[PDB]
Amino acid sequence: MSVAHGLAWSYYIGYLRLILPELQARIRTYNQHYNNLLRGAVSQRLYILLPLDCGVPDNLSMADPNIRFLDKLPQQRVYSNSIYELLENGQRAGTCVLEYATPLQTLFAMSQYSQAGFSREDRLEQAKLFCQTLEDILADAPESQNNCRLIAYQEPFSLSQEVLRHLRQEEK
Amino acid sequence: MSVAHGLAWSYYIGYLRLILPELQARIRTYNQHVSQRLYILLPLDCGVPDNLSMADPNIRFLDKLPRVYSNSIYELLENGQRAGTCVLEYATPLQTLFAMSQYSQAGFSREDRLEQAKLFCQTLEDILADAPSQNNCRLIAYQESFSLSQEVLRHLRQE
Ligand SMILES: CCn1nc(C)cc1C(=O)Nc1nc2cc(C(N)=O)cc(OC)c2n1C/C=C/Cn1c(NC(=O)c2cc(C)nn2CC)nc2cc(C(N)=O)cc(OC)c21
């Protein structure tokens, strides 16, 4: 329905269209001049986490102990994008720029506030339609699809393995 | 109906609920070491310019109010004299409604933009009426001779 439609368009206009054109250059700059020489290159593309239950925690490292914060990307009013290391059996298995799609926090809060007239069933339906609309916007957005990946997932699960699966899919 | 609903809720959850509880203390700190309340400009035609001072010469930037949130303090001039001073800013979700009316893929008409701008104001007013936020902010809705400085001064004198 139209709630998800407006949120996906807002997320694109007010944020993704402003950060994705220069993201590739920032990632290259970090790999060439800031990344520790004993580390693997940070993967290209912004990985956007889309929990379908709209459960967006405040700390990304507290959600999963295998997602460890590493550094902030060189800055692009201003935007702070974080680089995370994904651990598998203690070893570093991948490194990427990761963050939650914040409009799903709004969908969660709307399902909690009575005045919003928004059910928990409406939340799940609108979360899926938010992902659909955002995927359609990014499919034809100039310099945005090849610079980001949408990670949609449902929970009853390892969030670190969910991100690693998408990273290995791009490599294969 | 629902585009405006989602934007008003997003503006509250992702921004106003995080800045309005501590705004009164930041305003007091500036005065001790500018009127209370955040004045949110809501142009119903969704014409949000990038520079506030360029929109009206009688609205002059004075200083920034000390996640990082930067709010700007402005002086409102009347016949050259300083007639009021307040923390002022545009409701940025109206810039999204304007852009949606411009992008073909959004399937959003200019008529849909005016309807959704009014419903955004209505939903935001209802949220703020019962948010634990109302006494720390005021909504200035207007349709653009028109003077934006006089529009803000009218609300300041009403309080
Ligand atoms: C608007 C795009 N959007 N739409 C949906 C749906 C979700 C998002 C979204 O995810 N936005 C987003 N993510 C970011 C991540 C980073 C990063 N990685 O560091 C940096 C960012 O920009 C600084 C990010 N932004 C931009 C805005 C962030 C919050 N914010 C707002 N927000 C709104 O007005 C608004 C309008 C509607 C509708 N909903 N909201 C609430 C979000 N006004 C602010 C004013 C000031 C100030 N006074 O200086 C400071 C702010 O926050 C520091 C302000």
Side-chain angles (χ1 to χ4, degrees), chain A residues 2-21 23-61 63-75 78-119 121-124 126-139 141-142 144-170, chain B residues 2-21 23 25-27 29-31 34-35 37-53 55-59 61-63 65-66 68-80 83-104 106-109 112-114 116-124 126-133 135-153 155-158:
Chain A
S2 268
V3 164
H5 188 71
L7 294 176
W9 278 97
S10 185
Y11 186 57
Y12 171 71
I13 302 296
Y15 179 59
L16 304 172
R17 80 169 182 172
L18 301 163
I19 68 141
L20 298 175
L23 193 88
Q24 185 168 288
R26 291 166 69 201
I27 287 159
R28 286 193 263 90
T29 295
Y30 184 88
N31 287 332
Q32 286 170 235
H33 313 294
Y34 293 86
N35 199 16
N36 186 91
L37 296 170
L38 302 158
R39 275 196 224 112
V42 316
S43 297
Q44 283 291 341
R45 308 185 183 82
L46 176 67
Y47 284 89
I48 299 161
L49 298 165
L50 292 148
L52 290 167
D53 69 344
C54 305
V56 175
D58 208 58
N59 197 344
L60 225 157
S61 298
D64 189 335
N66 299 300
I67 306 166
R68 186 170 64 196
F69 172 75
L70 179 69
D71 249 333
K72 246 79 171 72
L73 264 174
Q75 266 175 4
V78 77
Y79 306 98
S80 62
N81 299 99
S82 296
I83 296 153
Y84 293 89
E85 280 180 338
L86 298 154
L87 313 177
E88 189 175 273
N89 307 304
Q91 296 225 274
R92 292 173 282 182
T95 313
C96 66
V97 184
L98 191 69
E99 60 188 60
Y100 288 104
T102 52
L104 298 174
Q105 279 178 274
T106 291
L107 289 169
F108 187 81
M110 284 173 80
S111 73
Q112 292 202 286
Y113 279 86
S114 64
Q115 192 190 97
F118 201 75
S119 179
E121 290 92 46
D122 292 349
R123 186 184 71 196
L124 177 63
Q126 296 302 293
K128 286 168 170 163
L129 291 153
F130 168 85
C131 298
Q132 180 174 264
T133 308
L134 186 60
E135 176 110 313
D136 290 344
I137 291 156
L138 294 162
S144 273
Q145 195 184 28
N146 64 330
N147 306 107
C148 95
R149 246 68 186 158
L150 304 187
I151 307 169
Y153 56 92
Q154 209 141 28
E155 290 184 63
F157 179 78
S158 165
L159 183 59
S160 57
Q161 283 307 126
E162 192 61 48
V163 183
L164 285 163
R165 190 178 59 76
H166 285 85
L167 280 165
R168 288 150 180 169
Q169 195 89 273
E170 259 69 62
Chain B
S2 269
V3 164
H5 188 71
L7 294 176
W9 278 97
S10 184
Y11 186 57
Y12 171 71
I13 280 94
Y15 179 59
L16 304 172
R17 80 169 182 174
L18 301 164
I19 68 141
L20 298 175
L23 188 84
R26 280 170 66 192
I27 283 158
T29 295
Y30 184 87
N31 287 331
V34 60
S35 295
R37 308 184 183 82
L38 177 66
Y39 285 89
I40 299 160
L41 297 166
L42 292 148
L44 294 154
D45 68 346
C46 305
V48 175
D50 207 58
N51 198 344
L52 266 82
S53 299
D56 200 68
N58 295 330
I59 288 160
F61 173 75
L62 179 69
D63 217 322
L65 179 65
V68 168
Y69 305 99
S70 62
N71 302 96
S72 297
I73 299 152
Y74 293 89
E75 280 180 338
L76 312 169
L77 312 177
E78 189 175 273
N79 307 304
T85 312
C86 66
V87 184
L88 191 69
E89 61 187 60
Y90 287 104
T92 52
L94 298 174
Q95 216 161 20
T96 290
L97 290 168
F98 187 81
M100 283 172 79
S101 74
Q102 292 202 286
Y103 279 84
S104 64
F108 204 74
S109 179
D112 292 349
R113 181 185 67 192
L114 177 63
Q116 296 302 293
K118 286 168 170 163
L119 291 153
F120 168 85
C121 298
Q122 286 175 6
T123 308
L124 186 61
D126 290 344
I127 291 156
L128 294 162
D130 275 52
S133 271
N135 64 330
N136 306 107
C137 89
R138 250 52 154 173
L139 305 187
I140 308 169
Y142 57 92
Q143 283 259 255
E144 282 229 33
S145 178
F146 180 77
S147 165
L148 183 59
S149 56
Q150 283 308 127
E151 192 61 48
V152 183
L153 286 163
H155 285 85
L156 280 164
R157 288 150 180 169
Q158 195 89 273

